[PDB]
Design a protein around this ligand. Structure first.
Ligand SMILES: [Cs+]
Length: 361
């Protein structure tokens, strides 16, 4: 429905007002768009993440901050972060969520470089795809799916985590690193979303393919060394991300499927989940690896009578071909081997060469 576009209504309907006394802040664990993030306890008491709103906020800033919880409270899935509640009546504003001990996915994979199996990475991807399938069936377009917005708990369960609003695109074109601000980065956004602001579940599928690449590389940066402008031009001209090291051919095949230029040709999230589950339940399909070239940060785009005789070094037969009536190409491609014998190509090697060449035409 439209319950994803009204933050105040969402806060009213889908959040639980928590009293400040029930919250105990313990230790800073991150720095968010709106303020600091703490690990603490919520009342037996349970560990939780506590997002706070920096003092001196604008009214619209307050609205946008609590709107994330308004969205999050509408969901309920194993692979979507759980909302305990919010503090809105007393300062500072706060959002309470389940604690994810291992934090952001990309940082975690970097810390655990090479410490998992390809099967475990594909299982993480399956969990993320399950969360995104849930979101898509709820008619929710994330617009900002990336490994940094996926959290990981003790049991390596991955959950989608960032449900902000007023999301706008990265405007810095000469940049190569991460830009300042809570913007949607160009490197994870589908082409139509950049060019025409057409964010759909298919653009989320594109970003999910980027997340797949992220995981298979243990948290590398997409389009490394390239600039946002170079990334946009590359994607428009057909370039794509290259094969990760030690990547199953099936997984890179699926990534490339997610990155189809025409959004309609991309797989839906149900298809994604089915493919990943099939692969996991038959892990022998993950041993065939896709070719790896350590030099590339991007894959190249894909491609769309005398001359023919000289292509095979038989130009000296040209006059013969002209004398027997084979003056045009359209009639030669319809030529049989007995016609070749008849015209004067008596040597067997020449017959064989002309025949193999003819097969192509
Ligand atoms: Cs409420």
């Amino acid at each position: 429905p439209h319950t994803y576009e009204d933050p105040n209504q969402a806060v009213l309907k889908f959040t639980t007002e928590i009293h400040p006394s029930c919250v105990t802040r313990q230790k800073v664990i991150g720095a968010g768009e709106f303020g600091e993030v703490y690990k603490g306890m919520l009342k037996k008491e349970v560990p939780v993440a506590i997002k706070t709103l920096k003092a001196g906020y604008t009214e619209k800033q307050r609205v946008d901050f609590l709107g994330e919880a308004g969205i999050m409270g509408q969901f309920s899935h194993h692979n979507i972060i759980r909302l305990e509640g919010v503090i809105s009546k007393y300062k500072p504003m706060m959002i309470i969520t389940e604690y994810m001990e291992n934090g952001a996915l990309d940082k975690f994979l970097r810390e655990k470089d090479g410490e998992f199996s390809v099967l475990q990475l594909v299982g993480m991807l399956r969990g993320i795809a399950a969360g995104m399938k849930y979101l898509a069936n709820m008619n929710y377009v994330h617009r900002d799916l990336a490994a940094r917005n996926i959290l990981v708990n003790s049991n390596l369960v991955c959950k989608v985590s960032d449900f902000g609003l007023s999301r706008v695109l990265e405007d810095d074109p000469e940049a190569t690193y991460t830009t300042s601000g809570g913007k949607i980065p160009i490197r994870w956004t589908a082409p139509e979303a950049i060019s025409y602001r057409k964010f759909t579940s298919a653009s989320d599928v594109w970003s999910f393919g980027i997340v797949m690449w992220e995981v298979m590389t243990y948290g590398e940066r997409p389009y490394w060394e390239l600039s946002n402008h170079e990334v946009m031009k590359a994607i428009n001209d057909g370039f794509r991300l290259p094969t990760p090291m030690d990547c199953p051919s099936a997984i890179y095949q699926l990534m490339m499927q997610c990155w189809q230029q025409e959004r309609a040709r991309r797989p839906k999230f149900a298809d994604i989940v089915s493919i990943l589950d099939k692969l996991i339940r038959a892990p022998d399909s993950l041993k065939t690896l896709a070719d790896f070239d350590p030099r590339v940060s991007i894959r190249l785009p894909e491609t769309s009578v005398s001359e023919w005789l000289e292509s095979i070094k038989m130009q000296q037969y040209t006059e013969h071909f002209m004398a027997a009536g084979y003056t045009a190409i359209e009639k030669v491609v319809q030529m049989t081997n007995d016609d070749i014998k008849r015209i004067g190509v008596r040597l067997p090697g020449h017959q064989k060469r002309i025949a193999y060449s003819l097969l192509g035409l």
